[PDB]
Fold this sequence. Notes:
- Two copies of one chain form a homodimer.
- The first copy, chain A, has a single domain (about 1-208), classed as Heat Shock Protein 90.
- In chain A, about 35% of the residues lie in helices and about 25% in strands.
- The first copy, chain A, has helices spanning about 10-20, 30-50, 85-110, 185-195, and strands at about 5, 65-70, 75-80, 130-140, 145-150, 155-160, 170-175, 205.
- An eight-stranded mixed beta sheet of chain A has the order 1-6-5-4-7-3-2-8, with helices on one face.
Amino acid sequence: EVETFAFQAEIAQLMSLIINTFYSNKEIFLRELISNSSDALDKIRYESLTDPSKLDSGKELHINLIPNKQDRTLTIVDTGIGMTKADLINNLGTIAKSGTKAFMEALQAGADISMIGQFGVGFYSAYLVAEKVTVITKHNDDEQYAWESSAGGSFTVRTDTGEPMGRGTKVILHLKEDQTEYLEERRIKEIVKKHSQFIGYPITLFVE
Amino acid sequence: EVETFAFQAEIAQLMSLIINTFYSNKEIFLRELISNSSDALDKIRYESLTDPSKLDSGKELHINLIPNKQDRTLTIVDTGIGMTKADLINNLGTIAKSGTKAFMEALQAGADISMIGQFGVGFYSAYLVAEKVTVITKHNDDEQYAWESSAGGSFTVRTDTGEPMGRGTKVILHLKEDQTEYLEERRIKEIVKKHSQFIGYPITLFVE
Lengths: 208, 208
Ligand SMILES: CCCc1nc2ccccc2c2nc(N)nn12
Ligand SMILES: CCCc1nc2ccccc2c2nc(N)nn12
């Protein structure tokens, strides 16, 4: 059973801005997603200090970047804390509401799209390069979910009956036709070195 | 009753590096503490979405910067999530252990002290300007604590029987004799504008 939801108006407006604005420095999407993964990993690590059973879903704390030319996807995988159904449907959108407003105000004040991460909505920079984003996530004490959106004001959530992940988040970027450079090893390696050099977790770039 | 603890060796080593290294761009301490406050405020806001009773200790989410020439202090106050006794004594030091190692490696690799925030140990940049740091903190379901350190490898924690805060953290910087510029309105305002322009909470700079 697939449920369809409308984004909050402000989020839909943000996504359209991201999709519509002429902005060539698209590569910043990768720094934002890795930064989200790092935050998610910081969260599970912190929580495991007071409750060590939280690592029973997996002890290794890392980030994998997986390009697939056959499927035209770049997947960012982490073993961070994961997201609950409420995160996916309600909670994150509520945080995203005030961030969006500030960001859209800052852009009019002369800021640029690369600063999106300072407003807590960097996940949406995925839409710089992806026609569709699929997010597979698994939080302790909740089921595994698949969230999906090709923008246009709506997203879906289903209970994921695919392959179990243990704990964490996979962001699958279905790349736009003209954005397949982000499937190239040299290109990803360049970007990670330029913007994500000091992340406190191993980042493995998979090869094809 | 005041308890005295030793920092972990790596943290003590970090503090000595911060205190000893010739480094003129000391003003970055303020961006790091405001960033910590913003993170703490993000935390309480997020948690209150699933448990609204968490805001019974105070709904207003903000940052105050309070200079006091008489006491030679600059205080950074937030109404974020606050810290537990275990945070103060154990948990934060455990996170700080891996961050320190990476940071001290990056510095040898050619990085500079301003990048300290990317390694999760930015709190310690307080020692660029402060001879002593006093932290008053109050987390829901725990008592109010005072943490204190003038470095030298040890810190203290006591149950705080001073004035109740409701919920959040006050970082009181007892400034070094030659660092009283950070008590000046123009100077603080300049620094906040330069480095903390897009924080998602009101930051009130108090006057004297
Ligand atoms: C968890 C932080 C990254 C993240 N992941 C998502 C996944 C699905 C839907 C929305 C989001 C989402 N909204 C915001 N503001 N951040 N965010
Ligand atoms: C809560 C994040 C800021 C913070 N506050 C403290 C207060 C007292 C002792 C240690 C810390 C501390 N250690 C680290 N790594 N961050 N941190």
